[PDB]
Short mmCIF file of C-alpha atoms in Angstrom, two decimals:
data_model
loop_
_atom_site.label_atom_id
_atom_site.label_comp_id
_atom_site.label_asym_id
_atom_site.label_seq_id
_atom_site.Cartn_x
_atom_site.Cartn_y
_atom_site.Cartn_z
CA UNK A 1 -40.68 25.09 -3.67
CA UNK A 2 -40.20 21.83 -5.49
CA UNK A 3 -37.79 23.50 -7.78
CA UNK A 4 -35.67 23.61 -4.77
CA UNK A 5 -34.64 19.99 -4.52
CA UNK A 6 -31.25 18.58 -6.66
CA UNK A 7 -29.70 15.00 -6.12
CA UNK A 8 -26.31 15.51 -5.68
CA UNK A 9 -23.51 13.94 -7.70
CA UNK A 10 -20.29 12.10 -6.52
CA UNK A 11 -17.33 11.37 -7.66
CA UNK A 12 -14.33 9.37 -6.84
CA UNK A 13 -12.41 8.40 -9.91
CA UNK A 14 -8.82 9.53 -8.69
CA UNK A 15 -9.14 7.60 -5.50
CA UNK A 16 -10.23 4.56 -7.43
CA UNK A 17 -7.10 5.14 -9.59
CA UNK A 18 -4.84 5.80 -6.90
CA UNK A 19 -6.30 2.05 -5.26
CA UNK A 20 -5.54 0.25 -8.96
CA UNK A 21 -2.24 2.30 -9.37
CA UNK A 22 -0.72 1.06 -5.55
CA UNK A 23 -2.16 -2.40 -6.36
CA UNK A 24 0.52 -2.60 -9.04
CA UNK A 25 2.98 -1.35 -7.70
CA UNK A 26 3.06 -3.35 -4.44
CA UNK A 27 5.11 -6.26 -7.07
CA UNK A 28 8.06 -3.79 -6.77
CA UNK A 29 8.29 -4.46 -3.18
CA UNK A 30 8.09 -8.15 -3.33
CA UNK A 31 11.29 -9.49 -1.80
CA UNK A 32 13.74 -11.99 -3.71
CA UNK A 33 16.44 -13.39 -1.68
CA UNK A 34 20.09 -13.16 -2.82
CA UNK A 35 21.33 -16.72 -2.50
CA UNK A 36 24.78 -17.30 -0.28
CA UNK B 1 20.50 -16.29 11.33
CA UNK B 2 19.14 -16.97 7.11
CA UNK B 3 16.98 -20.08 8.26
CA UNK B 4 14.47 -17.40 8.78
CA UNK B 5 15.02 -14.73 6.17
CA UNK B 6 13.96 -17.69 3.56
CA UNK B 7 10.56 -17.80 4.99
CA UNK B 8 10.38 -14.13 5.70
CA UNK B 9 10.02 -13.54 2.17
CA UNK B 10 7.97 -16.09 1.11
CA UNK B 11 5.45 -14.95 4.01
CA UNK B 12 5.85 -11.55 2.89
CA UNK B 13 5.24 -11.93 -1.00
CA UNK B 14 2.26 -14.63 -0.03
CA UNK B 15 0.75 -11.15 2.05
CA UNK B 16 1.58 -8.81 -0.46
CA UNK B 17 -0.52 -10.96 -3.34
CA UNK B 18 -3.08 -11.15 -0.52
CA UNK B 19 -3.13 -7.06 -0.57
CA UNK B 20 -3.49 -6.98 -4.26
CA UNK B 21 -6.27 -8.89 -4.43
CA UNK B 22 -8.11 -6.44 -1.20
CA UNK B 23 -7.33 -3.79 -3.24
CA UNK B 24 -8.63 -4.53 -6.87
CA UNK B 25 -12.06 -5.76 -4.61
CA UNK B 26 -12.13 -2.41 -3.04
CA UNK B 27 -11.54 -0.36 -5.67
CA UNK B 28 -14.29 -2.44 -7.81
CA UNK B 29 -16.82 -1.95 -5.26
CA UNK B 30 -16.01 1.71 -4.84
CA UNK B 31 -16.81 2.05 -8.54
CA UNK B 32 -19.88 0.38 -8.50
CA UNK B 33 -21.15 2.40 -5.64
CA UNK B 34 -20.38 5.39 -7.83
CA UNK B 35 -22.35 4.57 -10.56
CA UNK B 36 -25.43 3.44 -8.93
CA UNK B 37 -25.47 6.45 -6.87
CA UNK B 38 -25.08 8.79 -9.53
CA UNK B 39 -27.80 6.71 -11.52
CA UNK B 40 -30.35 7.27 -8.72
CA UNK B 41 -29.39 10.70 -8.67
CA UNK B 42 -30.61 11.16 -12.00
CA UNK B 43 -33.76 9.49 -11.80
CA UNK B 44 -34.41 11.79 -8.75
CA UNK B 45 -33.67 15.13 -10.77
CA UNK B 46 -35.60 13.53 -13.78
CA UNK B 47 -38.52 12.99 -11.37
CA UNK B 48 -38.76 16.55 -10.47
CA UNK B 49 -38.35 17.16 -13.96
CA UNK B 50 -41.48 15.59 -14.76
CA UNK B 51 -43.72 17.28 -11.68
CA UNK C 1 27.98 -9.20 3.41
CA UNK C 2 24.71 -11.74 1.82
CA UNK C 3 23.27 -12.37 5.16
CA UNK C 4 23.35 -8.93 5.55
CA UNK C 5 23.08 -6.87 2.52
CA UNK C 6 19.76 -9.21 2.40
CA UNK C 7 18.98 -8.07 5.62
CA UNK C 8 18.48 -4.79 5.34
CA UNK C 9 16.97 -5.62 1.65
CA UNK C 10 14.09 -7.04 3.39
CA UNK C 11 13.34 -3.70 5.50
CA UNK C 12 13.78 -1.62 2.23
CA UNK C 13 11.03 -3.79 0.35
CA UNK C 14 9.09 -3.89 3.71
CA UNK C 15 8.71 0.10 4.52
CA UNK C 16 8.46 0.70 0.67
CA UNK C 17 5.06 -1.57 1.42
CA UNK C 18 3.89 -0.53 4.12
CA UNK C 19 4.13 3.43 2.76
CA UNK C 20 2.14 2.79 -0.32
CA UNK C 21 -0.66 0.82 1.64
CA UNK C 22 -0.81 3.95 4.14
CA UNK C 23 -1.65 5.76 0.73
CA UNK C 24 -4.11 2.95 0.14
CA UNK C 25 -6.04 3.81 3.27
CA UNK C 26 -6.38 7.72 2.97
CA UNK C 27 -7.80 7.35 -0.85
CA UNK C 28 -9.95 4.85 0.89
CA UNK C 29 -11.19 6.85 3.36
CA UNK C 30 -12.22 9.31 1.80
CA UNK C 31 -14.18 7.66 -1.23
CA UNK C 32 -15.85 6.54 1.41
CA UNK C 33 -16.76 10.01 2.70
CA UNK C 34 -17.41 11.30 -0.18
CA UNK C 35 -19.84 8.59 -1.04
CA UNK C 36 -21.66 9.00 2.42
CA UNK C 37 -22.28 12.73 1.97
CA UNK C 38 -23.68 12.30 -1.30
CA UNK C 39 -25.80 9.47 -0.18
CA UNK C 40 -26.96 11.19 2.70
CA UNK C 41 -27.98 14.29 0.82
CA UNK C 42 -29.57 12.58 -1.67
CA UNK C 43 -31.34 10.72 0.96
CA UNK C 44 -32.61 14.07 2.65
CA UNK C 45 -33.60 15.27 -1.03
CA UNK C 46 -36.13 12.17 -1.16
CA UNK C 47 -37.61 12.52 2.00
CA UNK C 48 -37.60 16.33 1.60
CA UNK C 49 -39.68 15.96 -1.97
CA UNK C 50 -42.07 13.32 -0.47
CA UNK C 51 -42.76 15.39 2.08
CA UNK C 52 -43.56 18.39 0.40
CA UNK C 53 -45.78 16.27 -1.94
CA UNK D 1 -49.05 4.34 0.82
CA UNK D 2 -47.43 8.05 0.06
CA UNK D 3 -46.19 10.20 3.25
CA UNK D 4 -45.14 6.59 4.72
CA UNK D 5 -41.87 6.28 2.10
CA UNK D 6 -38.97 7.23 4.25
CA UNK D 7 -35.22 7.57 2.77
CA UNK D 8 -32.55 5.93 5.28
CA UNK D 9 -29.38 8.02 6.13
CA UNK D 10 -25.83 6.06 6.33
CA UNK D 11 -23.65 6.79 9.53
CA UNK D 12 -19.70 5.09 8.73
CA UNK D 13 -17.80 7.61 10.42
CA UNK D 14 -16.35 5.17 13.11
CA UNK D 15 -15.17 2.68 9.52
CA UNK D 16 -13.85 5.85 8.05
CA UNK D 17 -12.26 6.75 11.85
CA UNK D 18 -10.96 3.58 11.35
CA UNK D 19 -9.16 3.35 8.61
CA UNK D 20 -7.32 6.59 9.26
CA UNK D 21 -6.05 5.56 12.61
CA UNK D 22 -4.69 2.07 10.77
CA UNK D 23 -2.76 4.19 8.09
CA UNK D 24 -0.76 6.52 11.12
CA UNK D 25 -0.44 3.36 13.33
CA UNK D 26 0.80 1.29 10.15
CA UNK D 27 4.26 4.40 10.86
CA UNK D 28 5.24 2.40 13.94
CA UNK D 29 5.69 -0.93 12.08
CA UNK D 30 8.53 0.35 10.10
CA UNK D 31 11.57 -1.14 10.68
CA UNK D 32 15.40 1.32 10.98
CA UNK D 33 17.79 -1.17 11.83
CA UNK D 34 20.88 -0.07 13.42
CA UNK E 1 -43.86 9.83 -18.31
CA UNK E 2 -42.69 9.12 -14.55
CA UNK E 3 -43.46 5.34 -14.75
CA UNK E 4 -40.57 4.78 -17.08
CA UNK E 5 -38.26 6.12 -14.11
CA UNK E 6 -36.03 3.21 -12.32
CA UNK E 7 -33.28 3.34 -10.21
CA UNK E 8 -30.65 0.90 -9.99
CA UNK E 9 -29.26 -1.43 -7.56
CA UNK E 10 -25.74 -2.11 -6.41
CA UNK E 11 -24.75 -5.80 -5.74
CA UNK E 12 -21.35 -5.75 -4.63
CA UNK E 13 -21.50 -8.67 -1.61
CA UNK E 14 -18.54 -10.40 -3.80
CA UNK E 15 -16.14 -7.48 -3.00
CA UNK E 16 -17.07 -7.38 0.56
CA UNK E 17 -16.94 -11.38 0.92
CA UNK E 18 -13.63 -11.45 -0.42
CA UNK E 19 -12.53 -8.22 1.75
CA UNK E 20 -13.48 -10.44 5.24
CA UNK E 21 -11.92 -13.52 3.70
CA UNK E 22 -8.59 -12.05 2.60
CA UNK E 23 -8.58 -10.71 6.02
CA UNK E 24 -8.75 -14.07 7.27
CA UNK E 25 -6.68 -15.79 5.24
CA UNK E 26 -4.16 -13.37 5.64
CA UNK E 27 -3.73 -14.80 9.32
CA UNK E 28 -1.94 -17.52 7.36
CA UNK E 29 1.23 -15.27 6.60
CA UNK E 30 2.45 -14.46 10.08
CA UNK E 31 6.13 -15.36 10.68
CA UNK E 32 6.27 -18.01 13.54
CA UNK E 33 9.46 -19.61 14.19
CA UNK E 34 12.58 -18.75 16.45
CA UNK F 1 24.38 -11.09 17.59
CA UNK F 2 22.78 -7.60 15.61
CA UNK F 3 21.55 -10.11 12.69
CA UNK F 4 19.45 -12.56 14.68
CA UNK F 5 18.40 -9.65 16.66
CA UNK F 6 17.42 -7.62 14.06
CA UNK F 7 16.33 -11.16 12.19
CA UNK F 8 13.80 -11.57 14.97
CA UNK F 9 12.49 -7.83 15.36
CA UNK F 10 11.65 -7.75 11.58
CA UNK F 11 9.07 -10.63 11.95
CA UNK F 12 7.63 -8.89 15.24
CA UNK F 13 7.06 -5.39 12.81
CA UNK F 14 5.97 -7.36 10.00
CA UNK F 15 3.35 -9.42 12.31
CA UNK F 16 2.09 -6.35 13.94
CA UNK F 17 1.49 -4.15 10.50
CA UNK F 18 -0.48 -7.56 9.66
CA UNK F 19 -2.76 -7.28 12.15
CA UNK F 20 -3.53 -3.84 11.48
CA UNK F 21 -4.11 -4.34 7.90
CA UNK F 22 -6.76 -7.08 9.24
CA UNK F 23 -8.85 -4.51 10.85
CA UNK F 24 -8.72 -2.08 7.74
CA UNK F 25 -10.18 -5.07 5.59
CA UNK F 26 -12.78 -5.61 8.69
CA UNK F 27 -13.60 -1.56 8.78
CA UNK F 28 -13.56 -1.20 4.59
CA UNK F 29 -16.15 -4.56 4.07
CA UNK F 30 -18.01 -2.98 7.38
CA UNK F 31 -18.54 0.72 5.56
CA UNK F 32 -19.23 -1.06 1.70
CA UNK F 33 -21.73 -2.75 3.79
CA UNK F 34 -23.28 -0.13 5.36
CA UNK F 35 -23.46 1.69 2.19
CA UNK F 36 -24.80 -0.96 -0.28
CA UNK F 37 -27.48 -1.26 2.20
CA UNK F 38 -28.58 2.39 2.59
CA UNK F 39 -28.67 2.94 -1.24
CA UNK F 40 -30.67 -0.02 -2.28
CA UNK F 41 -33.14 0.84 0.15
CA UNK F 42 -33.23 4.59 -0.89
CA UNK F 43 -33.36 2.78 -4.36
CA UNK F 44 -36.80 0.72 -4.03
CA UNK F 45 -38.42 3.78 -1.94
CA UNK F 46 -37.71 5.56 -5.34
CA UNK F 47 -39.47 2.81 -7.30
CA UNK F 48 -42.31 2.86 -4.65
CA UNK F 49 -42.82 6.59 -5.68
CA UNK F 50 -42.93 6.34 -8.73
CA UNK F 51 -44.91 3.19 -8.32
CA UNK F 52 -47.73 5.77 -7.14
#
């Protein structure tokens, strides 16, 4: 039957927040040097 | 040995800002992707719709 | 005491990195999965419907 | 012109291989200083 | 009817150019001294 | 003695884990590739369909 075919639907929203969420918070790990 | 931790950092803050940037691209293209997809999914179904 | 408390500073801020890119990679990996499958099936669907028709 | 349209399958299962492998081989950079 | 249909394109060669290039350019942060 | 030691190891982890990241960008722009591709020609055989 032709009734038989459905497209499929995707979705990937909470790994494309967890990508803009690390992107932030790799500043926490940038390094600053205590001076002597 | 602190010669070398100054440029330690800097070389490791220089690749972090370097991994932001990689990420926010992937990310956007990952959400593109998505949307076209799921837009040509639609016009599929709708086709079948109308036959 | 500086030379070192910096020292292992440096590690701290390095593994802290290096976990949260590891995370990076798995969320990447599978949007990307997930995107193939659907593309794949909705690839079959077309050819399936064209061929029927 | 219709039978001839043909939809195209994606393989990236050796990318998504890949990028799995990096993650677990990313654990033997870490540093433990003694 | 069906000749109103359209399906979209994805253009997302910026993303992937900048992917390949930050890969290169982050050959530019290795440590090198002794 | 343990500080230039462990001065010098840090830069050997720090080099390697950037060389792996390399080859994630390489794999990631390799699949987005792949992908953009497959869809946009699944895309136009759509228009062609309905085109007819």
């Amino acid at each position: 039957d032709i009734s038989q075919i459905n497209a499929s639907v995707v979705n990937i929203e909470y790994e494309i927040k967890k990508l803009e969420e690390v992107a932030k918070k790799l500043e926490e790990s940038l390094i600053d040097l205590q001076e002597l | 040995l602190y010669e070398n931790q100054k440029l330690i950092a800097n070389q490791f803050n220089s690749a972090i800002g370097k991994i932001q940037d990689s990420l926010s691209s992937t990310a956007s293209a990952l959400g593109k992707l998505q949307d076209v997809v799921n837009q040509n999914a639609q016009a599929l179904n709708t086709l079948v719709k109308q036959l």
